[PDB]
Symmetry: C2
Subunit: 284 residues, 2 copies
Amino acid sequence: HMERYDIAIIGSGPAGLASAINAKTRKSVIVFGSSDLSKKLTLAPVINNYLGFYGIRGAELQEKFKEHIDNMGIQIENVKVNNIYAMGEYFSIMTSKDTYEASKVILAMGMEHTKPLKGEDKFLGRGVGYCATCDAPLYKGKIVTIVGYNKEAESEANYLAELASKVYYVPRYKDEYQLVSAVEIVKDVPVEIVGDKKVEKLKLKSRELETDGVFVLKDSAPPEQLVPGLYVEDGHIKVNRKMETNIDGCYAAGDCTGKPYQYMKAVGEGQVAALNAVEKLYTK
Amino acid sequence: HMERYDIAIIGSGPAGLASAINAKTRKSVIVFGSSDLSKKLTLAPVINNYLGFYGIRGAELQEKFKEHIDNMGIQIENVKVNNIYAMGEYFSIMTSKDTYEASKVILAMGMEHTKPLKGEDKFLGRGVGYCATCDAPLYKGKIVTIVGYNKEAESEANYLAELASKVYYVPRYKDEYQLVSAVEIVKDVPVEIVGDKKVEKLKLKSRELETDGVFVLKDSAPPEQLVPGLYVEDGHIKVNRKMETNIDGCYAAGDCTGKPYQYMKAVGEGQVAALNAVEKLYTK
Ligand SMILES: Cc1cc2nc3c(=O)[nH]c(=O)nc-3n(C[C@H](O)[C@H](O)[C@H](O)COP(=O)(O)OP(=O)(O)OC[C@H]3O[C@@H](n4cnc5c(N)ncnc54)[C@H](O)[C@@H]3O)c2cc1C
Ligand SMILES: Cc1cc2nc3c(=O)[nH]c(=O)nc-3n(C[C@H](O)[C@H](O)[C@H](O)COP(=O)(O)OP(=O)(O)OC[C@H]3O[C@@H](n4cnc5c(N)ncnc54)[C@H](O)[C@@H]3O)c2cc1C
């Protein structure tokens, strides 16, 4: 069904966990993200600029962070947040599973490193989107191509196969893929989304797919799509010294706020966002 | 004599150490402060909001920070910084011992918690000051009272006893005091600095001292006195998202920049300041 919380934290990396441990000062808090917290932490080899942990390996620091949240009774809700609608005094939070409401939101999604595909921006809203399940009814009986950058994208492909006339899945990571037989896996490199007034084809290095929709599925939609009305410049969510965005009650912390992309900056921002959000909840 | 460095960090607490470990990316760096890093860290009992160190004691976290800087060959220069003069393209740094020049400065002095004495602001520049050794020639053959909040203040009293006709030392901490016999220790509580056009007396709870100067000696002068021309509001050094102050080449990080006074905020700010300072050194 629906569940209400005082604070929702969108991301489970350094920034979101820093927010969570500072918000547990009560005030219900929910943290959305991945079971493994942050993929970048796991991939980091030796870390020498996180003060107090000289020479730690990324996966070791990840475990220290996991034990911290576990000691404080903080769990990660393992769902993808698709859209956050600023209703004015609260936020409606749409996810890959259930819908939530929260009084305050802390954006902590990190920063996407991969570039958009050619034609992606051009056809946005004319056949390109960032949430396949959200737009699924629009593609009933149509051809849909999903360019998947994470495992959740596979679930969206499976769902779309129940409505679309044909589903192609283009993986952008190496794994076994848990897809129903109706999904055609296209192990090729996307080149360009093309069309006249709307999407007509996805061109790949060795193949072209006639398709009505192309969904580009990453850990998070671009922030201005995830949070309609949010002020972003240069792909960075713009915040002030209190980590406040342009949307009252919506904060942002970590790589999603701009450079430098470092752990200490991220945890500091998460702390500031959470303490300010809590203050606003007690002052109304 | 004088020594030149690319970056000078003013403070050895969480913020300054975070700056130091991020600036050692070369670029000579000098860190001014106390041997014990930060007094607040030592006094902190259990810390649960420093991500990755759940349940750590303050002195334990202090030791982790000490081992980090030691592993990176970062030493603390154990002197008090008295004044930083923005010369335009560099900074002249006056200390309780030698003078330094630095291309970039990172202010990391923390935030003073004790309030000013009554009359302190009123007589500033008319008998009240924050550096006794700096103003010592002005008090040759005059009466000087030092209200000392740290051990360095004792050294300043000893120096002033060579020039002033009479030196009183009013300690604001419990310890043995290493003072020459010419210094009179006044174990009483300051109440008010009084005078007409200039300082004439220090009133204490049980005694009044006729005095020509009153020096209030804390770990650092107020930031607008430490750094002439620095923009401060509400006792907080005002910085932007890059930790830049109003003075080009001068950054600030940690409690000295405003609330919340927390460790994660401080280390994040120190990191941002240092990485920006380094960038400016490589771009000129
Ligand atoms: C190989 C490598 C080495 C690095 N080494 C260092 C180093 O030595 N020192 C250093 O300071 N920095 C280092 N970094 C950078 C550092 O990892 C980042 O600055 C830091 O991880 C930022 O954390 P964050 O919480 O802002 O974002 P992230 O760490 O990206 O966390 C984001 C998390 O939120 C989840 N999420 C995002 N959007 C949504 C959504 N819509 N719904 C649900 N969940 C979502 C993601 O799945 C992810 O788990 C390194 C990065 C890499 C890639
Ligand atoms: C009892 C107590 C418990 C606390 N518990 C927590 C907690 O659980 N979690 C949390 O997040 N925060 C806590 N805090 C607050 C936290 O300690 C501060 O936010 C943090 O120490 C800020 O560090 P900083 O580097 O900005 O300043 P500081 O820690 O004050 O470091 C300043 C250092 O620079 C030196 N210095 C200053 N001026 C000069 C100068 N002119 N020349 C030379 N050296 C100078 C000082 O001697 C000092 O050593 C606590 C504070 C106290 C007092």
